[PDB]
Design a protein around this ligand. Structure first.
Ligand SMILES: Cc1cc2nc3c(=O)[nH]c(=O)nc-3n(C[C@H](O)[C@H](O)[C@H](O)COP(=O)(O)OP(=O)(O)OC[C@H]3O[C@@H](n4cnc5c(N)ncnc54)[C@H](O)[C@@H]3O)c2cc1C
Ligand SMILES: Cc1cc2nc3c(=O)[nH]c(=O)nc-3n(C[C@H](O)[C@H](O)[C@H](O)COP(=O)(O)OP(=O)(O)OC[C@H]3O[C@@H](n4cnc5c(N)ncnc54)[C@H](O)[C@@H]3O)c2cc1C
Lengths: 637, 629
């Protein structure tokens, strides 16, 4: 390997393999994930020309065959555990999105959970070999966040006992569903149920959209791809227009609501529904940030440029303080998000045990924390990925860095499972609700128990830093509450008040979530058995928290949480941590255990042999298919 | 038009035309710019299918076709004024980069300002009928920022009287030059001059790389495209490897240094100013789209009873877009300021007065980094403020983002630039330390409160700048003191130094924006810009409250009033949002945005766009039969 990377790995003060165990959950987990990864790696059926060297059409085509192959292979290998299916799918698509995401993630799961025996035989079973391919169509051109505003109608017809699915306007057309564009022949559509002159709200219906065998669109059906996007080249995000399309009455999912043959409309928290409330975007954020950091840091250890001292030769750019400042706080963030994502997993499991005991008390906080962490981590990871890219200089801009694809692939996560701003406002509804409760004399519990200490620190220890974040969260919640009451007590409608306090409310949710990450990171440390590993993660933990304090110094000063002098100490300690982390930077990134193939990066290769490979890469790219480009003869010659 | 956009326009308290006048510098500049943009809009030779519906190869091809026609068309129309050239070229490529960029910006300009009668005869003249297509090759795979690290050599050969251009290592291969991939048959190459066993530094040579008429790479010449990037699809950024490749000794640009047959060796600010304008323009486009779309898009609710409101009515939406709108105008003004400044200092240089040249270099480097980094993040905020729809190329913001973002790394990597600014700031600091009075925009360092006034806010930025410079200076001393080494000390203080330059530059933008108001003749226009200026200043104080609180420049109670004033200002700006974006005068064609269309008729046009998308050439995709069946 490149002498420069070898030098970095030799300076590491800890064994990176021990951290990999921690990330996967156990040594055993690491082995299994690697085993599954190697199944795809050495399988030529999963190999193909570099995504970036292919047109959009060819990219979608490649994704399709790999997904089709993926299904057959997972069936044959007997991979049923959801975690293992995740690892397997990750290795096959290398973080890239694929056309069977909704089919496997929402279509089959919804049928398995709510469909009747006859329905599953008609819609679930035929999918085993993809005879049937489905997707979930909810979003419309005119409504994404505001569901109640959806326009698709499903009117019951007593005479023929079938539903009439209709897209009355341009805005009503379904828009975005992955696989809806060209892959799926069936789609579970969400529509406003209409029967006996009454609208009963949103209900789901199984609707065939393409003829089996020929894949031609069925009469009354209009489907297609929505066009090119920032990223997602391999995903056929689509649109669906239904011209008073008829389907059997038995195609409605009736586990919760039913429609009798005469048109009469009739009418719990389970482990079943809980699987749907589950989210993996926090882990997704951690992972994407990690990939970017791995690339940027390795490259920064490989790239030599400029000079620190005129007498010495060009140093590694990772020797520059500004370089370390750009990347080490993000590396610490990457780790913080991994621990938070693991905490959430733990919580889901803790919550099921509570539900099984009849205790639904922590559900409100779960839903608020879930919406909050999702927005906090996705936004932070989003910006962090681009910093990593720009930290690589000009080469970061080339697809050979691998970062532009990571960013473009990850960024819509700020939209998935609820707009980030809307989600933060959801977290704020809960924070205000708990605040009002404490106001009326109730002692509250949970991560939000600090509210019991309203109304409104040793900056050197982890405990004092956690406390500082706790106090800052309390302070921002207090500011939002008071400001909210000022509008209300001004005779304004609770709603107008809400809007006029929304910026403040989002900030309260943000502060709350940041405090949660810090506490979770800090709580992790005492549980690390290996002292060397513990020491490094501690430095990363100190950097994450100190850096957050510097980033929003105003929050801590305004609340008199820290003094101006303490802010100076915080800033100084941050610079000191950068160098303490420096000798371990590479090994910390190696611990993420990404294979070159997943990274899709010349610059971030494990071996550090960037330059020779960067040249081969460019020479094999499409514009060099010929020495002279036809445009020459036609317009220049 | 969409009645939602017309009611937004009807509520405007000023005439947008007057702001366009201010943006173009004068009413006549507008009329003239709008003339050119029309020469092109109605010309079939510049029409083609949406770039986003084409492959990388087809994009490059369309760019090449348009640029070639561009040169012919300009010459024939009489467009030679380099300003009118920007407008024309901007309309033609609809804001996208083009393969003749270096040819017109570096090749010709360099020849025209350094070539001899013989050279300007066989090099400059041919680049008339594009007979010759050239580019400038500086950057190498191994070096971009630190030029004296370049490896390309030009070893003079006394016997045959010709320089030998060589790429000894993989890292020495030229990398990135636009037009170097498949467009140019000639390239001015920057290389280490070596003659008579001695290296004399970097010098520029003109080297033919492709055979005229066939475009075949010449013997010893290896050329090609460097591959696909985040953006720049229509640009053939390339690589050049020269294997002991010989060129007439007479091919060296000897305007400043010469090499006779004996082998005896003898004897940037405008571009950064351009990028600041490029930052303002890109930010403006994004804002125009995001704001127009926010007035068109209705969703969710405020009051239970009322119908879905335009998302522009949500405070959060206003908070995301109005501060950025104010930033776009702020950046346009500081850009104009930079222009006035370099023109003035240029005039001094000519009279032997170079007293303001160091500040000019420093300010120009700092503002470039400050505005490009700010606009960069702002373009993405505009995209995300559009919801999922923003992610689609139908929003046109992703292309804007991808096209503008490299501005943060080329022409001086932002952090390196800020570091240069900091070097100047420290010098000035040491100068006042010695007891000297300094002038210029930095005269506030000779001195080493009211949140409700324009003057007080400007004053607040001044002190914040002074405070950060002082913190950097103090930390720098503390390090030279403890570490006893200047280079090590500089490095351990570099984050503080960058922060001080950022603070200095922010102060400049505010001050410039503020000094611009009294010069506005129309009262209504002056009134709206004033709100944007207050928003800009107040927003920055909130964003980095700790800087002001730390320096006892503002109290906690004042920070609170700042935040309250920002919210109030969003409200006061709301009624003028669309008109303020309309003022930019961007045409639908150069915006390439369905969501930001001037008429506001989004949805109907959106479906048509998707319907026309490449993946819908057929109802069923080929991949179905061969894989999913
Ligand atoms: C890559 C990608 C893939 C997708 N895949 C799928 C898929 O497979 N299936 C599917 O069903 N959908 C999919 N979608 C659509 C996604 O579900 C929607 O984008 C999401 O629901 C938000 O809808 P919208 O974009 O119209 O947002 P809108 O809410 O209409 O607009 C967003 C803007 O309005 C603001 N806003 C909205 N309501 C409020 C409020 N009450 N208060 C304050 N601010 C508010 C937002 O914060 C934001 O600035 C995808 C989108 C993308 C980009
Ligand atoms: C779209 C695009 C188009 C381009 N077009 C052209 C073109 O037409 N012609 C051309 O010649 N070039 C072109 N380039 C190359 C561009 O000029 C270089 O990328 C730029 O000069 C920066 O060089 P670098 O990428 O090697 O940076 P590097 O410096 O190698 O790396 C950047 C990183 O190193 C850090 N760093 C470097 N030096 C220092 C220092 N002294 N102190 C502290 N930190 C430091 C930076 O802060 C940053 O994080 C283009 C690049 C792009 C992306």
């Amino acid at each position: 390997m490149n002498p420069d990377l070898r030098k970095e790995r030799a300076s590491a003060t800890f064994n990176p393999e021990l951290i990999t165990h921690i990330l996967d959950g156990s040594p055993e987990n690491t082995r299994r994930r690697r085993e599954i990864e190697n199944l795809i790696l050495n399988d030529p059926d999963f190999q193909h020309e570099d995504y970036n060297f292919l047109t959009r059409s060819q990219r979608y085509e490649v994704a399709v065959k790999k997904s089709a192959t993926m299904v057959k292979k997972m069936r044959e290998y007997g991979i049923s555990d959801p975690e293992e299916i995740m690892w397997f799918k990750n290795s096959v698509h290398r973080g890239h999105p694929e056309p069977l995401d909704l089919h496997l993630g929402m279509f089959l799961p919804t049928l398995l959970h709510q469909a009747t025996a006859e329905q599953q035989e008609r819609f679930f079973m035929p999918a085993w070999n993809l005879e049937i391919t489905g997707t979930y169509a909810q979003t419309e051109m005119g409504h994404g966040t505001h569901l109640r505003g959806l326009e698709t109608t499903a009117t019951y017809d007593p005479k023929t006992q079938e539903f009439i699915l209709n897209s009355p306007t341009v805005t009503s057309i379904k828009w975005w569903p992955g696989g809806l564009g060209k892959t799926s022949n069936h789609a579970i559509v969400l529509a406003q149920l209409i029967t006996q002159g009454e609208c009963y709200g949103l209900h789901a219906f199984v609707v065939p959209i393409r003829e089996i065998g020929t894949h031609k669109p069925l009469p009354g059906i209009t489907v297609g791809d929505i066009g090119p996007k920032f990223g997602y080249e391999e995903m056929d995000n689509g649109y669906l227009k239904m011209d008073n399309y008829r389907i059997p009455r038995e195609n409605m999912l009736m586990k919760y609501a039913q429609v009798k043959p005469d048109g009469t409309y009739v009418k719990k928290l389970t482990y079943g529904t809980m699987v749907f409330v589950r989210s993996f975007l926090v882990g997704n954020a951690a992972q994407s940030l990690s990939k970017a950091c791995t690339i940027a840091i390795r490259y920064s250890a490989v790239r030599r440029q400029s000079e620190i001292k005129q007498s010495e030769p060009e140093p590694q750019i990772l020797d520059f303080q500004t370089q370390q400042y750009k990347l080490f706080p993000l590396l610490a963030t990457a780790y913080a998000f991994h621990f938070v994502g693991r905490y959430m997993k733990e919580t889901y499991l803790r919550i099921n045990e509570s539900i099984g005991q009849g205790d639904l008390s922590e559900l409100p906080e779960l839903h608020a924390l879930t919406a909050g962490l999702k927005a906090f981590t996705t936004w932070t990871a989003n910006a962090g990925i681009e910093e990593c890219r720009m930290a690589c200089g000009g080469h970061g801009y080339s697809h050979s860095s691998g970062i532009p694809n990571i960013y473009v692939t990850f960024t819509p996560a700020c939209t998935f499972e609820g707009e980030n701003t809307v989600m933060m406002l959801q977290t704020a509804r809960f924070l205000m609700k708990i605040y009002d409760q404490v106001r009326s004399g109730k002692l509250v519990g949970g991560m939000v128990s600090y509210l019991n200490d309203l109304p409104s620190v040793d900056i050197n220890s982890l405990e004092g830093l956690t406390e500082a974040y706790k106090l800052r969260a309390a302070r921002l919640v207090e500011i939002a509450a008071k400001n909210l009451q000022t509008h209300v007590s001004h005779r304004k409608s609770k709603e107008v008040a809400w809007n006029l306090t929304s910026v403040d409310l989002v900030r309260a949710s943000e502060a709350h979530c940041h405090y949660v990450v810090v506490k979770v990171f800090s709580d992790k440390l005492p549980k690390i058995q290996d002292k060397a590993v513990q020491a490094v993660l501690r430095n990363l933990c100190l950097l994450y928290s100190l850096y957050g304090i510097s980033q929003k110094g105003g929050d801590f000063l305004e609340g008199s949480i820290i003094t101006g002098a303490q802010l100076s100490q915080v800033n100084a300690r941050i610079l000191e941590l950068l160098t303490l982390i420096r000798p371990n930077a590479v090994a910390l990134v190696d611990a993420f255990d990404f294979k070159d193939m997943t990274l899709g990066s010349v610059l971030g290769r494990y071996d550090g042999n960037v330059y020779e490979n960067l040249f081969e890469w460019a020479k094999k790219s499409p514009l060099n298919k010929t020495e002279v480009h036809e445009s020459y003869h036609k317009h220049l010659k």
